[PDB]
Ligand binder design. Structure first.
Ligand SMILES: C[C@]12CC[C@H](O)C[C@H]1CC[C@@H]1[C@@H]2CC[C@]2(C)[C@@H](c3ccc(=O)oc3)C[C@H]3O[C@]132
Ligand SMILES: O=c1ccn([C@@H]2O[C@H](COP(=O)(O)OP(=O)(O)O)[C@@H](O)[C@H]2O)c(=O)[nH]1
Length: 427
């Protein structure tokens, strides 16, 4: 059985879908992964997957595709949509001349209009949600008009205004982003399969509520591996020199960027903490680091790298905590790895994830802005996690969640059962 997979063109959307594809390929399915040309330019390793990669045009002007969208999200997301509709149609028409014929298209939930392409081509459509049910519920309420972006929503903790998904940070892209998030639920009744990268035990009540509206399949964590350059050997050799529970892993993901002034705060907090640290600073961001930071002043205790093998880093026993922007993949990967967090959310669902991390799952602490987070606050959070009694509690809580995540993906577990149900439905 031949499955097509079409992620939104960004690493937090590609990666969780890739991991689901790898699990499906392990069960005997053929996989074709559909990527934009801009994504393929960053792809360095794919021979070992056995998954076929088929590219489509970016469909918006070239100058990554994402940094073009941000220039004008309202227009360029719509141009991306129209081009993706045309070019995935053309690609599927071609794939229908080859055996095995495609049967289902799994697409990122942010691209609901791909359902119409799947159905027009005679395929089943599966919408793949890359954020948890608790945060997706807010987008559903946004579509319903129940909330426009203290706040009480069914089966969610009481939220402050600050805990709602942050779109005001995007300035003139705010309304376009709020619309795209809400439109994930615009055709949910017509989707053949609704897949969420979460597991039931993590959010029992909101998953139960969602399931009373639509049949949903919680299949997460989909993560068990890399398409992009991860500097694996350099990172893993450095971590192998570190003793247990001594390393702060620091990463703000694939998209977020911090100001030069904020970078200085983080640099100084890491140095004066006197902890070992592995800090992912993307290539296009390292110019904002203090002058001799990468080459000299970080060499005694730190490794500054443009990308790491994050699953392998979070699995390493030297890692004591994860200073994170709280993107959903990073949050879930840290929880499933038993790694407590220091929450520094930037925008979109990161704000809500940071609330869930700190107050519901209780595996992290959050920083306080002054709107710059200062070194002393970061140092204070580091001391709380690394040294204080509260930090031992967060570590114990993270280990309990690791165990529940292990149950979910093992035989008889909720996510294993749901992937089996999906897999059998196709057979
Ligand atoms: C505006 C922008 C800011 C960061 C950077 O400069 C890029 C900007 C343009 C893209 C934007 C990004 C913010 C986060 C997104 C909305 C995110 C997404 C997409 C679909 C979805 O369902 O959920 C979340 C991933 C990426 O599409 C984002
Ligand atoms: O050095 C890094 C940093 C991040 N990641 C991966 O990149 C994704 C980041 O996704 P997330 O939802 O956390 O945030 P985003 O980048 O979408 O804002 C996750 O799959 C991480 O495992 C990685 O492989 N190496």
């Amino acid at each position: 059985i031949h499955i097509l997979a079409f992620p939104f063109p960004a690493k937090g959307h590609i990666n969780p879908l890739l991991h689901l594809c790898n699990r499906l390929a392990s069960k005997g399915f053929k996989i074709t992964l559909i990527t934009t040309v801009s994504t393929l330019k960053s792809v360095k390793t794919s021979k070992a997957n056995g998954i076929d990669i088929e590219s489509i045009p970016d469909g918006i002007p070239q100058e990554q595709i994402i940094t073009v969208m941000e220039m004008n999200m309202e227009l360029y997301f719509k141009q991306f949509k129209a081009s993706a509709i045309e070019n995935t149609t053309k690609l599927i028409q071609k794939l229908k001349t080859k055996n095995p014929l495609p049967k289902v298209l799994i697409y990122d939930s942010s691209m609901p209009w791909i359902l119409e392409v799947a159905h027009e081509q005679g395929l089943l459509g599966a919408s793949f949600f890359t954020q948890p049910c608790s945060v997706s519920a807010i987008y559903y309420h946004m579509l319903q008009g129940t909330i426009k972006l203290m706040v009480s929503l069914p089966y969610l903790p009481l939220l402050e205004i600050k805990d709602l998904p942050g779109v005001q940070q995007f300035e003139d892209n705010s309304e376009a982003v709020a619309e795209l998030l809400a439109d994930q639920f615009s055709n949910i009744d017509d989707v053949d399969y609704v897949l969420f990268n979460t597991f039931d035990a993590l959010e029992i009540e909101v998953v139960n509520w969602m399931g009373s509206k639509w049949p949903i399949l919680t299949v997460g964590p989909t993560a068990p591996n890399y398409l992009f350059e991860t500097n694996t050997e350099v990172c893993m050799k450095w971590l192998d020199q570190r003793e247990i529970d001594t390393v702060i892993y620091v990463s703000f993901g694939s998209l977020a960027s911090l100001t030069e002034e904020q970078m200085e705060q983080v640099s100084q907090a890491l140095i004066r903490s006197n902890c070992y640290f592995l800090w992912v600073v993307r290539e296009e961001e390292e110019n904002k680091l203090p002058k001799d930071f990468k080459e000299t002043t970080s060499k005694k205790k730190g490794l500054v790298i443009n990308w790491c093998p994050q699953l392998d880093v979070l699995a390493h026993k030297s890692v004591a905590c994860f200073m994170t922007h709280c993107g959903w993949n990073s949050t879930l990967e840290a929880l499933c790895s038993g790694v407590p967090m220091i929450c520094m959310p930037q925008w979109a669902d990161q704000t809500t994830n940071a609330k869930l991390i700190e107050h519901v799952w209780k595996i992290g602490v959050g920083v306080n802005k002054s709107g710059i987070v200062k070194r002393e606050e970061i140092e204070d959070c580091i001391r709380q996690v690394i040294e204080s009694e509260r930090g031992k509690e967060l570590k114990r809580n993270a280990i309990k969640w690791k165990e529940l995540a292990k149950e979910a993906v093992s035989e008889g577990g909720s996510s294993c059962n749901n992937i089996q149900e999906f897999s059998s439905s196709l057979l």
